[PDB]
A paper describes a structure:
[name] and [name]-10 are TGF-β family signaling ligands naturally secreted into blood. They act on endothelial cells and are required for proper development and maintenance of the vasculature. [name] and −10 are synthesized as pro-proteins and processed by furin to release growth factors comprised of two cystine-knotted protomers that can covalently homo- or hetero-dimerize via a single cysteine in the dimer interface. Unlike other ligands of the TGF-β family, [name] and −10 are secreted as a mixture of disulfide-linked dimers and monomers, in which the interchain cysteine (Cys-392) remains either paired or unpaired.
Hence, purified [name] disulfide-linked dimers were crystallized under neutral pH conditions similar to those used for the cysteinylated monomers. The first fraction of this single crystal analysis had too much free cysteine to model the disulfide-bonded conformation, so datasets from nine crystals of [name] disulfide-linked dimer were split into 8, 16, 32, or 64 parts, and the first fraction from each were combined. The interchain disulfide remains unbroken in the first fraction of the 32 and 64 splits, but is broken and the cysteines are free in the last fraction of all splits. To model the intact interchain disulfide, we inspected the first fraction of the 32 and 64 splits. In the first fraction of the 64 split, automated fit functions still placed the sulfurs beyond disulfide bonding distance, but a manual fit to the omit-map density produces a perfect syn-periplanar (0°) χ3 dihedral angle Cβ-S-S′-Cβ′ with full occupancy. While the observed χ1 dihedral angle of Cys-392 is both an uncommon and high energy conformation, the χ3 dihedral angle (Cβ-S-S′-Cβ′) of the Cys-392-Cys-392’ disulfide is an extreme outlier as the χ3 adopts a syn-periplanar conformation placing the Cβ atoms directly across from each other in the same plane. The intrachain cystines have no outlier dihedral angles and all disulfide bond distances, both inter and intrachain, were acceptable for this resolution. The interchain cystine of [name] has one of the highest energy conformations possible,, yet this is the dominant conformation prior to radiation damage. This is surprising, unless no lower energy conformations are accessible. Analysis of the [name] disulfide-linked dimer structure revealed a highly strained syn-periplanar interchain cystine prior to radiation damage, and an unstrained free cysteine after irradiation.
Author numbering:
A (entry chain A), B (entry chain A): 325 to 429
Amino acid sequence: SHCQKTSLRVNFEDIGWDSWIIAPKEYEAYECKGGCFFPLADDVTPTKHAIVQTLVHLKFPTKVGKACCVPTKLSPISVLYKDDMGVPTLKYHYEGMSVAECGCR
Amino acid sequence: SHCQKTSLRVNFEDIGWDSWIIAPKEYEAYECKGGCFFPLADDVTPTKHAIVQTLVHLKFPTKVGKACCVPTKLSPISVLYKDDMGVPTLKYHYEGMSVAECGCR
Ligand SMILES: [Cl-]
Ligand SMILES: [Cl-]
Ligand SMILES: [Cl-]
Ligand SMILES: [Cl-]
Ligand SMILES: [Cl-]
Ligand SMILES: [Cl-]
Ligand SMILES: [Cl-]
Ligand SMILES: [Cl-]
Ligand SMILES: [Cl-]
Ligand SMILES: [Cl-]
Ligand code: NA
Ligand code: NA
Ligand code: NA
Ligand code: NA
Ligand code: NA
Ligand code: NA
Ligand code: NA
Ligand code: NA
């Protein structure tokens, strides 16, 4: 039950972006969920600082928070958007929209 | 009160690393602390996914967790360590030990 990519389907109208995004209506953003506690998995790929903070958090749980399961690499998607003039326009690689990799940081 | 680098002084014996680290006894690791909620600061430098997840978390706080204030760039330190033979040896750039930048991810 450690840090990993799980599914997260995002509807653009729900987050108030339908005003400038015609299509798609929903996309697969994924999310990173899970713990960063010891012992770790063989593919968490954690930084030295995340390891140190996890140890410090264990010894002082009230003073220092835990490390975090976050996206460590993102992928683009394509969106059809009405530009400032108002015409549908394709953005082929809308960067940073979907999780490619998760990790403890 | 948004995501920012705050101080975190780490003692190597407290985290059980004194067995292979002779010096220094403590170092300044810093940590990233604060919220990732709207409105954001001019220097959070958040990814598109962190922005999307924050919106989804606002609309569905029980199903989707918040974005995270984590280190986005790390700096090295120097440590004196007894090697596998047992002699003090300098590691000049022990990478990923201290926070250089924080951000919402
Ligand atoms: Cl481990
Ligand atoms: Cl590292
Ligand atoms: Cl593009
Ligand atoms: Cl291409
Ligand atoms: Cl982009
Ligand atoms: Cl904002
Ligand atoms: Cl991005
Ligand atoms: Cl080095
Ligand atoms: Cl150098
Ligand atoms: Cl290193
Ligand atoms: Na949604
Ligand atoms: Na949905
Ligand atoms: Na404590
Ligand atoms: Na292509
Ligand atoms: Na400590
Ligand atoms: Na200390
Ligand atoms: Na909810
Ligand atoms: Na140098």
